[PDB]
Amino acid sequence: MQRQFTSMLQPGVNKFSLRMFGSQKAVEKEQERVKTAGFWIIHPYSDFRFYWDLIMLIMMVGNLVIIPVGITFFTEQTTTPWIIFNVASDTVCLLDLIMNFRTGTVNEDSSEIILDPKVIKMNYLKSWFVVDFISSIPVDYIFLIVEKGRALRIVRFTKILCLLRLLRLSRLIRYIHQWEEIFHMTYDLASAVVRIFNLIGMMLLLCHWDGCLQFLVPLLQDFPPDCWVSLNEMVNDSWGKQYSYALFKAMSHMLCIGYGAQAPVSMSDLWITMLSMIVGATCYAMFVGHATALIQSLDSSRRQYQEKYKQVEQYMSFHKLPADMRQKIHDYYEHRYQGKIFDEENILNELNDPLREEIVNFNCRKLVATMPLFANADPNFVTAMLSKLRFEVFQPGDYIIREGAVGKKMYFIQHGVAGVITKSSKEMKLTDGSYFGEICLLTKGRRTASVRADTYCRLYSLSVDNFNEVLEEYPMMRRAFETVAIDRLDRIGKKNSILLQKFQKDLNTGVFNNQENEILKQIVKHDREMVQA
C-alpha cells in the first residue's frame, strides 16, 4: 500500500512535468527530493493532488449551490439527508484542511517548498488557515449544542451561522486558479476564453447567491408587510415558485433590466436592492470588458495584417504615388504575403539549426528534385546552399534582370516561367526548377541578357557574397557551374574567355575527370533540355 500510495503522491513523468522540469532526469531529481523530506509530503503537481482537488471542486460546487437554497427556502431543514450531507461536506473539508498542511507551495520565484515544519506549516497558518478553518467547522451545530446544553432567535442564529460555509468560495477560487494555470501551461488554452468562463461561473454563482439573499432577508425579518414577498402574496407559495421569483429579481438587477413586481418600499428591501444593483452592474461591466478582450484576441492575425497594409497605404499617400502604381503595390503585397502577417527573418532566427534546415529543405524539395545540379552531390552542400536563399515574388512583365548592369545575385525559379531576352537572339523560356544569373557572379562582369517575368514568378535569390562563401568550400560545384556557364555564353555570344581559361587549366590538370566529365555532360544536357521548352 505504501509503495502504490507514494508512487502517486510524488510528481509523475507526464506532459506538465516535462514542460516544468528540464527533462526526465530533473523529474526524477524532484521525485527524490519529495521522497527525502517528511514522512508523507504531497507535491502540488502529483496525481493525488489533482484527484483530491477534483473531488474538492465537485464538492464545493455542489455545496455552494445547495446550502443557500436549503437554508433560505426550506423551513426546519434538520432532516436526516441534510445532516448527512452537512457531515459529509464537513469531514471532507476537514480532510482537505489537514492535507493542506502537507502539500507544499509553488513560490512565485519558480521554486517548490517541501520543508514541512518550518515553511509549509508556518506559511499556511498565516495566509489562509483562519478562512479555511471557520468555513470547515460546523459552527451552527456547535452553537446549537451549546445552547441546548423563543426558538425564533435560535433559528435566526443557525441560519446566519450556516452562511459561514459560503467561505469555501476562497478554496474553490484558489483551486480553480491553480489548476487552470496548470492546464494553461500544459495545453494550448486561450487566456481570454478561460477568463471569460471564470467570470461566467462567478456571475452565475453571485446571481444565485443574490436570489437566495433577496428571500433570506425577508425571512429573517419574519416577513414584514412591507417586504416584496408579502406584497406579492407568495409567503405560502411553494419553494420552486419563490426561488424562481427571487432568482428573477436578482438576475434582473444583475443584467440591468429593472426591478421585480414594483420598486422597493421597505428600507431593508431598498438597501438589499441597491447592493444587488451595484454587484450586478460591476459584474456586467467586467463581462463586457472580458467580451471585448476576447473579440479583440479572436481576430488579431487579420488585424495585424490590416494595420501593416494601412501603414503601407499611408506611406504611399505620403509619397503621392499614382493610382496604377498603388494598384501594382497592392497586387504585389496581396500576392507575396497572401493576407498573412509574419517575418521570416525573425521566425527562422527563433528556431535552431536542425529545424531551420528541415523547414528550408521542405520548402525547396521540388527545387532539389528538379535541379540537375542538386540531388547529385554532397547534401551538406545542398543544405548550405538552401539555407542562404531568399524568397522573392516578381509580377508579370517586370524586368528582373537588366543587361549591362552589375551582377549581385542569381535566381532559382521555384514557380512560374521566365524569359531570357537578348538584343541579338530570340527569347528562351525557363520553366520551374531552372536558374539564371550564374555568369554575372562567376565572371564578376555585367549582365549579358535581360530576364522578363512572363507570369507571377516565385523565385529564390542567392547573394553574390553568400554564393562565393558557400562555393569556396566546394569547388567541384564551381566547375559544374562553369561547365554550363561557358555553354550558355557560347550559345548567346561566346566571349567566355575568363571562364574558358580556368576550364582549360582544370582539364589540363590531373583532376578526377572520370566522374566530373560525366556529371558535367549530364548537367549540360538537362539544362539544355529544360531551356529548350
Residue 228 burial by Cβ neighbours in a 10 Å radius (0-12, 13-18, 19+): buried
Residue 350 binds which one of its own copies, ligand CMP, none, with CB within 5 to 8 A depending on kind?
its own copies
Instruction: Give the C-alpha distances (Å, rounded to integers) separating 158 from 77, 162, 212.
Output: 11, 6, 16
Partner from its own copies, ligand CMP, none contacting 129, C-beta within 5 to 8 A by type: none
Which residues share a beta bridge with 461?
390, 411
Q: Determine if 407 is a binding residue for ligand CMP (CB under 6 A).
A: yes
Could you say which of 329, 492, 500, 524 contacts its own copies (CB under 8 A)? 329
Per-position x/- string for 2-31, each x denoting binding to ligand CMP as judged by CB under 6 A, each - no binding: ------------------------------
Question: Which residue number, 175 or 374, has a Cβ lying nearer to ligand CMP?
Answer: 374
Distance of closest approach, residue 100 Cβ to its own copies, in angstroms: 25
Q: Does 319 bind its own copies (CB under 8 A)?
A: yes
255 makes contact with its own copies (CB under 8 A): yes
156-157-163 Cα angle (round to 5): 95
Q: How far from each other are the two terminal CA atoms of the chain, in whole angstroms?
A: 78
488 contributes a contact to ligand CMP by CB under 6 A:
yes
Residue 344 is a binding residue for its own copies (CB under 8 A): yes
* Residue (of 140, 146, 135, 149) closest to 60 by Cα position: 135
| Torsion angle in degrees (nearest 10) through CA of 179, 180, 181, 182 | 50
Q: Which does residue 436 bind out of its own copies, ligand CMP, none, counting CB within 5 to 8 angstroms by kind?
A: ligand CMP
**Could you tell me which residues are beta bridge partners of residue 436?**
411
Q: Is 28 in the site for its own copies (CB under 8 A)?
A: no
Q: Which residues, including other chains, have CB under 8 Å from residue 245's CB and lie 6 or more apart?
A: 232, 234, 260
Q: Is residue 449 near ligand CMP by the rule CB under 6 A? A: yes
102 annotated as belonging to a binding site for a ligand: no
Q: Which of 451, 453, 457, 519 binds ligand CMP (CB under 6 A)?
A: 451
- With CB under 8 A as the contact rule, the residue among 14, 91, 127, 314 that binds its own copies is 314
Task: Check whether 457 is labelled as a binding-site residue.
Answer: no
- 492 is a contact residue toward ligand CMP (CB under 6 A): yes
Please name the residues in contact with 450: beta carbons below 8 A apart, sequence gap of 6 or more.
Answer: 399, 401, 402, 403, 420, 421, 422
498 binds ligand CMP (CB under 6 A): no
- Virtual torsion, Cα 230, 232, 237, 241, nearest 10 deg: -130
24 binds, among its own copies, ligand CMP, none (CB under 5 to 8 A by kind): its own copies
Query: Is 437 one of the annotated binding-site residues?
Result: yes
- Residue indicated by cell numbers 507571377: 456
Report d(CA 27, CA 164) in Å as an integer.
41
Q: Which is nearer to its own copies, 261 or 507 (CB)?
A: 261
Please state the closest distance from residue 434 (CB atom) to ligand CMP, in A: 7
Helix/strand/coil (H, E, C) string of 201-249? HHHHHHHHHHHHHHHHHHHHCCCCCCCHHHHCCCCCCCHHHHHHHHHHH
390 binds its own copies (CB under 8 A): no
Is 167 a binding residue for its own copies by CB under 8 A? The answer is no
State the minimum distance, in angstroms, from the CB of residue 478 to ligand CMP. 15
- Tell the burial category of 414 from Cβ atoms under 10 Å away from its Cβ (0-12, 13-18, 19+): buried
Binding site for ligand CMP (CB under 6 A): 401, 407, 420, 428, 430, 436-440, 447-449, 451, 488, 491-492, 531
Binding-site residues for 3',5'-cyclic AMP: 437-438, 440, 447-448, 488, 491
